[PDB]
């Protein structure tokens, strides 16, 4: 796929 | 220019004034670092790591490659390591949250980094950090491995006798932030793209971790702490 957003964020522990 | 040491060498490159082998050291340098961060904060258990050496006087925890979950998150790091070497990685970030996908943090571990061309003396390109750091020379393989021991030294000091125990509930996240550089088709495996970072309360109190100079490359590593 195509990436806009500057920010990626993951999982993820609770 | 290289570190003579068996201990040394299990973990990380001997060498790192090469661009390849200075961007696979950030690589390991954010497994090692961040897998202490985990650990020291209580926010996975002992189990899911093993015991390491940065020296044959120093140790550390390491994610486990055997434990499934502690596998998943240190290829969660490599995949951000990997992007190192394209230099697309603009920070790398574990942040903890009251609640799961909040914006604004409690706690947070960065590590900004600066790309060098040309013999990796010139930066590419605010931060507080990036006018010092920039300015920065690689000083040599055993300069870049006292950085590295100040810098887990630094962690396991601040997380065990600065920084308040952690809350009884909260959630625990790596977030990253792309390079300007970074084309549109580039994902990091494993972090889902994001229009929001995190944030950070006015009053929040900041301390230095430390830095890392390999050959053509250089990281921050900063910490925001309510518990501070």
């Given at each position: 796929?195509?990436?806009?957003?500057?920010?990626?964020?993951?999982?993820?522990?609770? | 220019?290289?570190?003579?040491?068996?201990?040394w060498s299990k973990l990380f490159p001997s060498?790192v004034?090469?661009?390849?082998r200075s961007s696979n050291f950030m690589i390991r340098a954010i497994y090692v670092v961040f897998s202490?961060?985990?650990?020291?904060?209580?926010?996975?258990?002992?189990?899911?790591?093993?015991?390491n050496?940065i020296?044959?006087?120093?140790?550390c925890?390491t994610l486990?490659?055997?434990?499934?979950?502690?596998?998943?998150?240190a290829?969660?790091l490599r995949?951000?390591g990997d992007?190192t070497?394209?230099?697309?990685?603009?920070?790398?970030?574990?942040?903890?949250?009251?609640?799961?996908?909040?914006?604004?943090?409690?706690?947070?571990?960065?590590?900004?980094?600066?790309?060098?061309?040309?013999?990796?003396?010139?930066?590419?390109?605010?931060?507080?950090?990036?006018?010092?750091?920039?300015?920065?020379?690689?000083?040599?393989?055993?300069?870049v491995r006292?950085?590295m021991?100040?810098?887990v030294?630094?962690?396991?000091?601040?997380?065990?006798?600065?920084?308040?125990?952690?809350?009884?509930?909260?959630?625990?996240?790596?977030?990253?932030?792309?390079?300007?550089?970074?084309?549109?088709?580039?994902?990091?495996?494993?972090?889902?793209?994001?229009?929001?970072?995190?944030?950070?309360?006015?009053?929040?109190?900041?301390?230095?971790?430390?830095?890392l100079?390999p050959?053509?490359h250089?990281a921050?590593?900063?910490?925001?702490?309510?518990?501070?």
């Amino acid at each position: 796929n195509a990436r806009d957003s500057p920010y990626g964020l993951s999982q993820g522990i609770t | 220019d290289a570190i003579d040491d068996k201990t040394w060498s299990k973990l990380f490159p001997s060498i790192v004034s090469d661009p390849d082998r200075s961007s696979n050291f950030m690589i390991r340098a954010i497994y090692v670092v961040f897998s202490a961060v985990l650990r020291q904060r209580n926010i996975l258990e002992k189990e899911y790591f093993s015991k390491n050496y940065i020296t044959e006087n120093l140790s550390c925890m390491t994610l486990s490659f055997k434990n499934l979950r502690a596998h998943q998150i240190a290829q969660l790091l490599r995949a951000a390591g990997d992007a190192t070497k394209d230099g697309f990685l603009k920070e790398i970030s574990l942040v903890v949250t009251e609640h799961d996908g909040d914006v604004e943090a409690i706690e947070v571990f960065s590590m900004k980094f600066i790309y060098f061309e040309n013999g990796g003396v010139v930066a590419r390109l605010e931060d507080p950090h990036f006018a010092e750091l920039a300015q920065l020379r690689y000083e040599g393989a055993e300069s870049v491995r006292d950085q590295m021991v100040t810098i887990v030294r630094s962690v396991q000091f601040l997380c065990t006798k600065v920084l308040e125990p952690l809350p009884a509930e909260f959630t625990a996240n790596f977030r990253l932030k792309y390079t300007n550089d970074a084309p549109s088709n580039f994902r990091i495996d494993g972090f889902d793209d994001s229009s929001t970072f995190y944030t950070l309360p006015d009053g929040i109190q900041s301390v230095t971790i430390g830095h890392l100079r390999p050959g053509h490359h250089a990281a921050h590593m900063q910490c925001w702490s309510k518990s501070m």
